[PDB]
């Protein structure tokens, strides 16, 4: 409709006076109207970094694509928009940030859906994993403060119920899911802000990813790339040492050159 | 429309202790806060607490002496006031809102849609 | 409370996070980053023009009283 055409353009181009006016007086408007690519007002405002429009839309209840807008904002590193979205009762009241990608794929609430069918990113990619993938240090910190963690993908030869039934079901989603989890674990954004000893964590993770490169021959390049990310993180931390005490901490751990 | 009613106010001597209660009727009150309005001035924030319990306090005069808390499950908002001062005499309101945004950490009265009637607190030295 | 090693690790990690953020700011600007600024002007234009219109309507109703 003309009201929805006008409303979508106002949100997309940051026409705050029009966006605010329509959300107040209009009683015949569907905030969930989509454009030619199936993007509603929230997804258009987040994509163009319209924080003022984003907060006006989120005040309107029955607004859709809340979960996808957070992932879209995290992907673009819009820190101010992220904390505006993370202040939506879909995230604040619930525990969506804390739950694992597996637990997320058991809810089946289509919260992070960007359209009738599908998600913008892989369903296994949680907000914390996406923030780690994009290496958004401030977004990772914000999600870590909320309790978000990356679950380790288990061993390749894991005979637990979850790893057995996921490999039996698809064996390709499971293979791609563990790469995404390790791609977030191996990010310097998550390595530095999660563990008390990132240098020890990166060294151990570098070995773990190197071994998986041989086991998963077809995704060998993916795992070798992630191993190098942990390899040059500890080199990066060593490069920042400025006196002997800092060097002796990185090299000896907590003079045995451990 | 959430219904907020304040209780616990009254007259206390300086340096005393008071506890304000706010009964909330409705479900979309994920953001609540306390606001005071001294006579001759504008309504200003005191504290604000989310559903998950994240709190922020307005200014540093009330920090450490005023504590906001919520039964959450029992739909009640509390303001523990200790070491009362004569300048704390005002009309205290509890406000609720479904969503605030990036401006929540400022405790600004204009961000809250539902308001209680307010209870008068008079601290006498 | 923290041990000396924890103090050193905290210094180096904060030194790493700030150095990583400086290195990101040295990367080339993409089209999407420039489009973000283009939308900042787009949003600012709408706010200012409407604000200018608010001056006109306030003066328009001022004539009625006068």
């Amino acid at each position: 409709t003309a009201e929805e055409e006008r409303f979508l353009d106002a949100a997309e181009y940051g026409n705050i006076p029009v966006v605010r006016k329509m959300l107040e007086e209009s009683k015949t408007l569907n905030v969930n109207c989509v454009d030619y690519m199936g993007q509603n007002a929230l997804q258009l405002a987040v994509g163009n970094e319209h924080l003022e429009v984003t907060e006006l839309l989120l005040k309107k209840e029955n607004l859709a694509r809340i979960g996808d807008a957070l992932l879209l904002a995290i992907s673009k590193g819009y820190v101010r928009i992220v904390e505006a979205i993370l202040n939506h009762p879909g995230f604040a009241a619930s525990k969506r940030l804390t739950l694992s990608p597996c637990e997320q794929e058991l809810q089946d609430d289509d919260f992070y859906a960007y359209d009738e069918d599908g998600t913008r990113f892989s369903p296994d990619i949680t907000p914390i994993i996406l923030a780690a993938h994009c290496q958004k240090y401030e977004v990772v910190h914000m999600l870590l403060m909320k309790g978000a963690r990356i679950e380790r993908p288990h061993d390749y030869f894991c005979k637990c119920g979850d790893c057995m039934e996921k490999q039996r079901h698809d064996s390709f989603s499971h293979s791609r899911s563990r790469i995404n989890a390790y791609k977030g674990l191996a990010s310097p954004a998550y390595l530095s802000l999660s563990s008390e000893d990132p240098v020890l964590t990166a060294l151990e993770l570098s070995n773990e990813l190197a071994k998986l490169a041989n086991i998963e021959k077809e995704f060998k390049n993916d795992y070798r790339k992630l191993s190098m990310q942990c390899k040059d993180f500890v080199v990066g931390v060593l490069d920042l040492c400025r006196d002997s005490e800092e060097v002796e901490a990185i090299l000896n751990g907590d003079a045995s050159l451990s | 429309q959430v219904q907020l009613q304040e209780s616990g106010g009254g007259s206390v001597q300086s340096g005393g202790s008071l506890r304000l209660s706010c009964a909330a009727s409705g479900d979309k009150n994920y953001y609540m806060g306390w606001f005071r309005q001294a006579p001759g001035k504008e309504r200003e924030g005191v504290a604000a607490i989310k559903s998950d319990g994240e709190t922020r306090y307005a200014d540093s005069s009330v920090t450490g002496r005023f504590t906001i808390s919520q039964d959450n499950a029992k739909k009640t908002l509390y303001l523990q006031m200790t070491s009362l001062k004569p300048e704390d005499t005002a009309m205290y309101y509890c406000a609720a809102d479904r969503y605030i945004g990036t401006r929540w950490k400022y405790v600004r009265p204009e961000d809250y849609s539902y308001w209680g009637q307010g209870t008068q607190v008079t601290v006498s030295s | 409370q923290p041990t000396r090693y924890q103090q050193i690790m905290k210094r180096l990690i904060k030194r790493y996070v700030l150095k990583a953020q400086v290195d990101k700011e040295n990367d080339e600007v993409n089209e999407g980053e420039l489009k973000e600024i283009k939308q900042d002007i787009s949003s600012l234009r709408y706010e200012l023009l409407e604000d200018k219109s608010q001056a006109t309507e306030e003066l328009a109703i001022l004539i009625h009283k006068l």
Binding site: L193, S194, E196, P198 | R56 | M9, K14, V17
Partner: peptide
């Protein structure tokens, strides 16, 4: 959450 707090609620 985070291992290191570089910054108490502000």
């Amino acid at each position: 959450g985070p291992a290191f707090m570089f910054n108490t609620s502000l």
